[PDB]
């Protein structure tokens, strides 16, 4: 059993990268780079990628990923790569040129703010309309090596079809925006039946194809249904949006649901990155730590031995388990901007098997030397994710 090197439930495989040089390895989960390479190798017709940005360093694991993507293009696979305009400033320009040089690849840059005010933040892949990948992993060499990252390879046809429809929607929207043509909003047509089983949730509502569950509705519904324990891991948690003139207006949707669950006696566990201990966010995090039944830990991943790496050595997985029975694996941090006005994707799996494996992964981090309880009395130094 022990030497089985992957974890699946029907329709879903759990895919995981631990930072190198940490006690966070999971030999039973396939890692991001190996899964992406195999997904590209299996492509016979189409590969679609929706990404926030593209960042590379010569000699990284992303080089192999890009090699397999290029080989797919050379094989005659049509590749459509959609990236957020705000991601350009985060991207490696040479890597963007390499992508454009792949045969049969079209690269489109979408300013998703012209649609809903936020960004294309989702990180996902589609192969032949048959398989998808959704996860925290950016198209970034650091996501493959230096960051705690979690995603799902999806073969559930219904869900893949919805992700494909979202990609098609945003691809065509990019072309309409380029021509200064209107992008019509999509009618909100929710199914009256309560969601069951395994399903996609997505944002923003206004550009969700028919029948795609609005994540901003579903996350509070899921939290309202919790009876015993909610465990959450994000990079960032804040009841705040990023507004004009650097303002940070209050954002209540998620925080109300967590506080409501806590008030019903549900135990809340929350893990965030040390990057989240910046001001003002740390004050609100301390505020949440005083709520009954809430425990918060801050996770610090140590630097890699060869030296400081900007915007790396951090936890990035966006995970939730409810009652050890329901699992959430998403692209969104839990602040304003993600579920309301940005393109994000989250998977909800009412799967005891997946929830148990995710709870083991969560406990591994929670119980590690990298996680420590929030300290109410401590003046957290400004994180310097970029350095110094």
Author numbering: -4 to 383
From the reporting publication:
Phospholipases D (PLDs, EC 3.1.4.4) belong to the phospholipase superfamily and they are ubiquitously distributed in various organisms including mammals, plants and microorganisms. PLDs catalyze two kinds of reactions: (1) hydrolysis reaction, in which PLDs cleave the terminal phosphodiester bonds of phospholipids to produce phospholipid acids (PA) and the free alcohol moieties, and (2) transphosphatidylation reaction, in which PLDs transfer phosphatidic acids to acceptor alcohol moieties to form new phospholipids. In the aspect of protein structure, members in the PLD superfamily contain one or two highly conserved HxKxxxxDxxxxxxGG/S (HKD) motifs, which were assumed to act as active centers. The catalytic mechanism of PLD enzymes was well characterized to proceed through a phosphohistidine intermediate that was formed after nucleophilic attack of the phospho-substrate by the first His residue of the HKD motif (H116 in SpPLD).
